[PDB]
């Protein structure tokens, strides 16, 4: 009786197919499902992720624990990945990785869930 | 080492009450919060944080969520009656043009084109 169910997939535009394979499959550690001429999809994060080969107001956050922060953290920097600022102390109390794909799609790693947000924090309903 | 879930989704909107209401009462989201400039909402089983920047100028990402197939009526109706931007599926925007598709079946299905090379 009338909800939106789950999230079906997210997909992006981007501009090398091979590079963005590399992303979400090598560094991210997703799996790569079936491609076509111009198109791969993906499993990550139990997501389907869609890329459209075509040659800021958003961001995609996935979560991560806490004790493989650093994990991560190491793997984006030993993998040059373009790594942005996050809040003060995000680093240090491995609360948030924030990057770039390949593209400039802004993603983040982050160690917290909705309630943890929720309780940390303004009007609540 | 696997990422083991998505955590949320933030898009950016000119107007947070026009953007409440959207996904609110059209598509039926639970608020959690508002502060700012900020509205959090609990959709589809997904957190979506909205940030309010009233002078925003959409084309390279979009979202899908999945929709019971005896609802497709459902909701085809209720985003045309309540004037919303519409391009089995529904593609459609929110107020400041974020892609959004609704669709009556999983994305895995769908792929289950012999050209294509499954894996």
Redesign the interface.
């Given at each position: 009786h009338?909800?939106?169910?789950?999230?079906?997939?997210?997909?992006?535009?981007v501009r090398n197919l091979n590079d963005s394979i590399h992303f979400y499959r090598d560094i991210?550690?997703?799996?790569?499902?079936?491609?076509?001429?111009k198109?791969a999809?993906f499993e990550?994060?139990?997501?389907?992720i869609?890329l459209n080969e075509?040659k800021?107001?958003?961001?995609?956050?996935?979560?991560?624990?806490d004790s493989?922060f650093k994990?991560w953290h190491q793997?984006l920097k030993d993998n040059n990945v373009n790594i942005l600022e996050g809040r003060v102390r995000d680093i240090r109390d491995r609360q948030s990785i924030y990057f770039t794909d390949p593209?400039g799609?802004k993603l983040?790693?982050?160690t917290?869930?909705?309630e943890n947000?929720?309780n940390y924090?303004?009007?609540?309903?």
């Open positions: 009338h909800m939106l169910k789950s999230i079906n997939h997210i997909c992006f535009s991210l550690l997703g799996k790569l499902l079936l491609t076509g001429k198109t999809y990550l994060a139990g997501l389907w869609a075509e800021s107001y958003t961001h995609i956050a996935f979560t991560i624990d493989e994990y793997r593209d799609h983040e790693l982050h917290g869930t909705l947000r929720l924090y303004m009007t609540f309903y």
